[PDB]
Design a protein around this ligand. Sequence first.
Ligand SMILES: Nc1ncnc2c1ncn2[C@@H]1O[C@H](COP(=O)(O)OP(=O)(O)O)[C@@H](O)[C@H]1O
Ligand SMILES: Nc1ncnc2c1ncn2[C@@H]1O[C@H](COP(=O)(O)OP(=O)(O)O)[C@@H](O)[C@H]1O
Ligand SMILES: [Mg+2]
Ligand SMILES: [Mg+2]
Lengths: 579, 594
Amino acid sequence: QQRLDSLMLRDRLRFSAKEIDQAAGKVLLREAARPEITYPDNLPVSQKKQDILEAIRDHQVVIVAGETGSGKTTQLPKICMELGRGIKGLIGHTQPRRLAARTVANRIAEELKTEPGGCIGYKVRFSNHVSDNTMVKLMTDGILLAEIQQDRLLMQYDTIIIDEAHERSLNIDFLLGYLKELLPRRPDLKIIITSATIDPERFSRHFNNAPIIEVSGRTYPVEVRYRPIERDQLQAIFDAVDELSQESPGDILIFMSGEREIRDTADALNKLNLRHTEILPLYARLSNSEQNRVFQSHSGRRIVLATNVAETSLTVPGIKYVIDPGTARISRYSYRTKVQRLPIEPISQASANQRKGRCGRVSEGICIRLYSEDDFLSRPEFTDPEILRTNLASVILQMTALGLGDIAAFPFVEAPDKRNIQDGVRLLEELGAITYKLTPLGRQLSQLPVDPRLARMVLEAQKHGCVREAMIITSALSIQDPRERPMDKQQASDEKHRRFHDKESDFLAFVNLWNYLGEQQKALSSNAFRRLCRTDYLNYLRVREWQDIYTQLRQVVKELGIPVNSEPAEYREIHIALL
Amino acid sequence: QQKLTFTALQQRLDSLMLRDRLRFSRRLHGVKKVKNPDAQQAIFQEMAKEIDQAAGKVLLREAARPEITYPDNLPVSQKKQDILEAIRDHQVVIVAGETGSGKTTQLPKICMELGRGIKGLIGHTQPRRLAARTVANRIAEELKTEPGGCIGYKVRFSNHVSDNTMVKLMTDGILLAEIQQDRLLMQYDTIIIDEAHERSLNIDFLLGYLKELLPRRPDLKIIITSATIDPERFSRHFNNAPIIEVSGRTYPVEVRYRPIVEEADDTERDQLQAIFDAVDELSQESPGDILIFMSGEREIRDTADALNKLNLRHTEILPLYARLSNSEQNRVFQSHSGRRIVLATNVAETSLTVPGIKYVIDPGTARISRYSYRTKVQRLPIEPISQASANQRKGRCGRVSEGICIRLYSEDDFLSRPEFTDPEILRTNLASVILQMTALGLGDIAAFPFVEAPDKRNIQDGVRLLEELGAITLTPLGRQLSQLPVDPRLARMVLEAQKHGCVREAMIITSALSIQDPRESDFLAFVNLWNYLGEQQKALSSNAFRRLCRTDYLNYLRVREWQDIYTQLRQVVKELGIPVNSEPAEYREIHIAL
Ligand SMILES: Nc1ncnc2c1ncn2[C@@H]1O[C@H](COP(=O)(O)OP(=O)(O)O)[C@@H](O)[C@H]1O
Ligand SMILES: Nc1ncnc2c1ncn2[C@@H]1O[C@H](COP(=O)(O)OP(=O)(O)O)[C@@H](O)[C@H]1O
Ligand SMILES: [Mg+2]
Ligand SMILES: [Mg+2]
C-alpha cells in the first residue's frame, strides 16, 4: 500500500500487486506529456506566483482574491501544475458560463503552446474535450455539480478551482457547501477559491479560516463623473460617448442590461458614424473570428458594449473609459407576485466599483455613472447572494436534482430562510415535481430556467399545443410590468394599454401586447419603434428584456424537444393549460 | 394497500422504456427468491410506484414526437409504405439504392412513423463524424425541430442528445464503444448501419456483433443501408433477410475512356492536362455541373488552383474539404449562375450527394488501407479503385438522362481492376484487428461471426506481436495503442516518442512508411529530407517550390502525398491529446525513441 500513493486517485482508491506496475505506467505517461510551464511576465499573478505556490502547497484551502485582469483565471491552473498537481488527478476549474470555460481552456492551451483537449481540456454541455493526457479540466460549475452523483468523492480531481466565486450564484454556493462537506474524507484534495476582492473573509471563515492571498497589481485612481438620468435612457449614453471621444486615445466599455439593448445601441452608434471609432458588441452568440478581435490591436477608438460579463469575468484589453448605467438583471423572488423574477435593478456599490475598476489599470481612466453620487452612496455595499433571493422551491428542486440532500443539513456559506422550507416542499409536491427524489416531470422542470410554477405551466401547454403562448406569458410574468401608468398622466397610458385587454384572463393581454409589439418593430425603424414605447407608455428596457427572456426560454424549450406551435393557438387550449 | 403479483407487475413493464423494463424485470426475478411473502409484498408495493414513475418517461417522450413529413421527389419517400411494412414485418432489412435515393435522411423518419424510437432510441451509424452531425442537423431541419431534440447526435467530443431524443446519429466507432457498458444495446430499439457497403472494420464488427445479439434482443430491429454493391452478402449474413431496392428510375450514363496521354512528359502536368481536356470535352455538352474525383485534399488544392489559372467563362471552381465553413458547406446545395466544377474525394462517391451534377471526371484512384507483407507495415497507398467504386463514381451523374462520365484511363484498364473492393477485414494486419477487438471486448477472433473472416493463418502472429509490444496479457499501453490508426508497431514508436518530445519526427517516419518513398539511420534520412522540404516551402513563391523538387530525386507528387498523410496523422494525434513539438527535435533522442 505504500507503493500506490503514486498511483492515480481512482486507481489508488480501487486497490487499497503487479496490477500496480501497470497502473503506475499511466502516471508516468502523463508526467511525460506535461508541457513546459511558462507565464507572461506582465501579469501580477505571474510575478507573485511563488507566494501563491507556497500557499497552495501548505494549505488544503486557499482564497485567491484580486482585481480583474490580475491573471487569476489564466495562470492559477499553471501554478497548480508547477506544484505537481494534475498528474494523479485532474485540476478541475469551474466557470459560471459555458463560453468562458471553453475560451479559458483554449487560451491556457495556446499560452502553453498545446492543443486544447490535450494538457488543457474542457467539459461543457454538448462538448467533452478531455483526453487521457488532460491535466486541467475547465468546466461550468453546473457541470461539476452534475458529476457529483456518479462520483461523490470527486476522485477524478486532486485540485478544484472555483472561479468567479464572488458571483455567489446557487451553483457556486452548492459547490462551496459540498466541498466543505467533502474535505474530511479527501485529505489529498486541494481547493482554490478564486474571486474579485469582495469580502473574501467570508470565504475564508467558511473554510476554517483559510488564508487569503490578495494578488492585485498596481491600480491607478479613476476619475468618476456623475451624469444622472428610453432615449432619455439612450441619449445619456450618446452624450457620455461624445464626451469621452474627446479624451486621449483609449477604448470605452459600456455596460448594458441585455443583448437586445446592446444591439439597439450598436445600431444607433453605427448610424451616428463616429469618426475613427469602431463599435464592438459582445454577445454570447459570437463567431470564432469575433472571439479574438476583442483582443486584436486596432487603430482608432473602440467602443465595446457588454453585459456585466465584462464586470469581473472577462477583461477587455485597452479599456480606459467606462460608461455605467448602473443597472443589471438579477434573479429575485417577488413576495408580491410569488414568482421568481428578473427585475432590472440598480447594482450594488461593490458591483459599481468593479465596473469603475476596469479603467484603473492605466492612469487617468474615467468612469461616467449615469446616476447621481447621492444614489451611489444610498445603494447597498454588496449584492445579495442568489441563495438569499431565490424561492426555496427552486433551491430544493435543484438540490434534489443534484442529490445534495436535505436543505436543512447542508453547510451553506449563507443558509436560506428555514421558515420557507416547508412551503417550497409543498409547492414542488403540488407541481408533481418530487416524491426526496425527482419525478420525470420534475427533471424537466429543473431544466427550465424560469419560476417552477411558471415552468409547470409551460410543460402543461405541451399537451395542448400552446407552448408559444405559455412562453410569452411566463416571460412576461418574470419581469416587472412593461406597461407604465404614470400618474403624471394616468390618462393615455391605461387607455393605450386597454387596446390589448382580453375577455377571460389578464394573462392574454400579454399575448395581445406581444403580437402588437410584433408587427411594429417590423414596420417601424429601430429608433422609431423605440419612440413608439414612450408614445405607448411601454418601458423600452422591459420590452427588450421581455423579448430577451422569451428568446432564451424558447431556445431551451426547443433543445429539450418540447414542441412549440408554429401557428398561434386559440383560446381554449391556452386556458385548460393555465387552469 | 391491495395485493400485487408477479404477473401483474411484469405485464406493467411493457409500457416502459426497454432499459427500464430490463432493470425492473431483473429486480422482479430477484424477488422470486425472497422466501418471506410479506417482504415480497413490501418490495412489490415500492416497485409499483417506481414503475408508475418510469412510465411517465414514456409519455413525456410521446409528447415530443414530431409530425413526420417526406420530400416528394425522393424515391425513398415515394416507396415509404413498402419500406415501413418491410421494417414492421422483419427483424432485419437490407435497404439498397443509388446515392440520392433518400436512405440516410428518410429511413429514421420511417422508423419513427412505425412507432419506434419511443421505448428505445433509433441508433443511426455513419463512418464519418462530420456526416453524423450533418445528417442529424438535416433531419432535424426537415422536421422543423432543434438538433438535440427528437433528432440528436453523438460523436467524439460532442454529445447532442436530450431526454427526448428519438434518433441518435453517431459514428459506428461511437456505437462500438458503447457495447462495454451496454452489452445488449438496450438503449436502442432500432439500429441503422449506414454506408455499410464501405465494409470497414467498424461496420464488420457491428454486423457480427448485431448478428450475435439478435437471439437475445427479439425486440430489436436492424436496418442495413447500402449502395447497390452486392447487398446479397448482407442478406445471407442475416439469414436471407429481405432486400428492399429503393432506387428511382435508372438513367444510363455515357462512359468515355480518356487514358492519360503522356504528352507533357510529366505525371502531374499529364494528369492536370488530362483533366483540362476532359473539362473542355464536357463544356461542349448541354448545361450541367461537373464533379471531379480526387485522391486527397492536397490534390484538390493543386487542381482547384490550376483550374482557376485557366480563367474559365462562367465557371465556378468549388473544392470540397472536410473542414469547410459550414456556411461554405451550405453552398453545395445552393443555387448558382453558370457552370460549377466540384472537386471532392471519394466522400462524394456514395456518402454525400452533390446536387445538379451531370458530368463526372474520374481519375480512378483512392487511398486505401492495405497491409504490406513486404515492409511488414499497414500502409495507405493510392491505388486504382475497384470496378464497383468506379461505377459508383459514374452513377453520380445518373440523376437525369444524358449524364457523361469521363474515365481518365482505358476500358482495358477498367476491366483489369477487381470487380469489388476488398473489405478492410481482408487487408488489415491481424495484430490491429485483434487489438481493436480486445479494446472493444468483442471476444475471440476465431469465434466472431464475420461477414468475411480474416485469414486465420495470421492470427497467432498477431497475438505474438501484441504480446511483444506489451499490449495484451488489455494493458493501459494497449489501450493507448488502440487509439492510433497506424500499424501497431509504428504506434508503439509514436507513444515512445512522446517520452522524448519527438512525436513530430515519429509522425514523419510513420507517414513516410505508410506511403511509397518520395525518392535505423535510414529513417533519419526521412527526417532530414522532411526538414529541408519544410524550410524551402515557406520562402519560395506560391506554386514555385514545384521546380525545387527536380533539384533532387524528389517527385513533387510523392512529397505532397507525404505531407497530406502527415497532416492527417497530426490531426488524429492532436485529438488524442498527444503533444507534438513545433520545433524539430534533436538528434537521437530519436534513437532512444526508436
Ligand atoms: N482569450 C484571450 N485572448 C487574449 N488575451 C487574454 C485572453 N484571456 C485573457 N487574456 C488576457 O490575460 C490577462 C489575464 O486575464 P485573466 O487571467 O482572466 O485575469 P483575472 O482572472 O485575474 O481577471 C488579461 O489582461 C486578459 O486581457
Ligand atoms: N445537408 C443537406 N442539405 C441539403 N440537402 C440535402 C442534405 N443532405 C441530403 N440532402 C438531399 O436529400 C437527398 C437525399 O439524400 P440522402 O438521404 O443522403 O440519400 P442517400 O442516403 O440515399 O444517398 C439528396 O438528394 C440530398 O441532396
Ligand atoms: Mg478571472
Ligand atoms: Mg446515404
